[PDB]
Design a protein around this ligand. Structure first.
Ligand SMILES: CC(C)COC(=O)CCCC[C@@H]1SC[C@@H]2NC(=O)N[C@@H]21
Ligand SMILES: CC(C)COC(=O)CCCC[C@@H]1SC[C@@H]2NC(=O)N[C@@H]21
Ligand SMILES: CC(C)COC(=O)CCCC[C@@H]1SC[C@@H]2NC(=O)N[C@@H]21
Ligand SMILES: CC(C)COC(=O)CCCC[C@@H]1SC[C@@H]2NC(=O)N[C@@H]21
Lengths: 121, 120, 121, 120
């Protein structure tokens, strides 16, 4: 919880501002340093609020639809990963970014990637 | 529209409400895996989609913990809603399990689900 | 082995002509019905030449680099999946399509998708 | 450029010859999982890449059967070679295991490896 709540950045310089509720909610804003995007976008997601005790990381995920007041890229990214607490805390994720497409173009609708988030404060 | 009760090819049940400002909320019930009864989901969708006939982009997350079970895992679906006579939500998903560092290389499954308003 | 070798088609109408060697090699050509592609492209791959007997599918994979005499899309696709035998023979796959990019565009280098192949028939 | 011995962040060993007309041939040794010693690999790469500073697209496959073990699985790596002072091969990979029809939804692992001339 307090481990996850805070501000994180990935290797691209994007900014991930998240609040982890005691229920398992993730709420916050995302600012991508790249792509058809500017300023902050609403995010929401979920996380395992009772993780395993064997030293495993905490599973989690969240979504951003790339519409705000400034731009709309008609697409959405989901990040799926785990929080790994400790000396060098991090959120290791893989993501899927789907753009709305016509049916003829559906085969190329989805980008796949990976972001590593590390935390300040 | 998006709000409704959807089923995928596995027989899983996706009950979702689309807010006017882009929020998705509801419950997910998986017919397979370490899962039982309903799980909370949240997500986002493009509340002002293109008019060129493109689908509506969206995504949502389920953390696989409820009062019945906890698989220490989370799935995210990324895809698009495609309107028409037979509405469909086409998705690909990433399912990540909490692992020790030794096992992180095998933390994540990938797959694809297609959702329809047709019951198993 | 005698199952995999053949001409397959996927849901896009692409043509996968493959030969499975006794040793585990896959060789042949791929013709995509969509994208920056025309005519046949060389593929190479591997498959499990001693599969389990519990009813599990046969694991396999292959690569096409999208360069031939006709075009060069500066891209490569890998299909990873399994062959499921029978009269209802199919190869179920997911794929990763990576394009060569500059460092600035690396985050968006890779598409992900899924193809299902069946025969003719 | 590509021809040589590479290592990823797991300590796995990627020995590859890149042919002039686009073949990749070599052996792979994974430092993790149900595997031991070297496995045959084969793949393809763009033998006439763009000159705009873009990387060189490539891919290869390993079937996890050798003389020592058989994991009834196959991994494909998809990525690009980036030449230069910090030369590397950046990939994402898909690992499918043979499954029964009922377990097909969980047949495929997804991940990412970065290969350098350095080992960890
Ligand atoms: C490529 C294009 C057609 C898709 O639309 C966007 O640019 C929306 C912005 C996506 C930013 C991605 S989301 C995943 C990746 N991580 C980040 O921090 N930023 C990137
Ligand atoms: C390691 C893994 C096997 C453990 O996690 C779970 O079984 C939780 C349940 C996951 C169900 C998946 S979510 C993606 C796929 N779609 C569905 O409707 N059901 C499946
Ligand atoms: C950025 C991208 C659009 C450029 O690369 C190509 O179009 C090369 C051709 C890709 C064809 C893909 S390979 C995966 C999918 N399955 C098929 O049979 N055909 C499609
Ligand atoms: C059920 C499955 C986990 C069994 O398959 C294997 O362990 C075969 C070995 C796979 C090693 C993977 S291939 C992708 C990843 N990168 C590496 O260098 N090593 C890992």
């Amino acid at each position: 919880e307090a481990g996850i709540t805070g501000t994180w950045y990935n290797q691209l310089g994007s900014t991930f501002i998240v609040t982890a509720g005691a229920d398992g909610a993730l709420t916050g804003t995302y600012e991508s340093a790249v792509g058809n995007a500017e300023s902050r976008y609403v995010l929401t997601g979920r996380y395992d609020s009772a993780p395993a005790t064997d030293g495993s990381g905490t599973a989690l995920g969240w979504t951003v639809a790339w519409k705000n007041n400034y731009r709309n890229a008609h697409s959405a990214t989901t990040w799926s990963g785990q929080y790994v607490g400790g000396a060098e805390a991090r959120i290791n994720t893989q993501w899927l970014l789907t753009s709305g497409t016509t049916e003829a173009n559906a085969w190329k609708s989805t980008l796949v990637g990976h972001d590593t988030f590390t935390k300040v404060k």
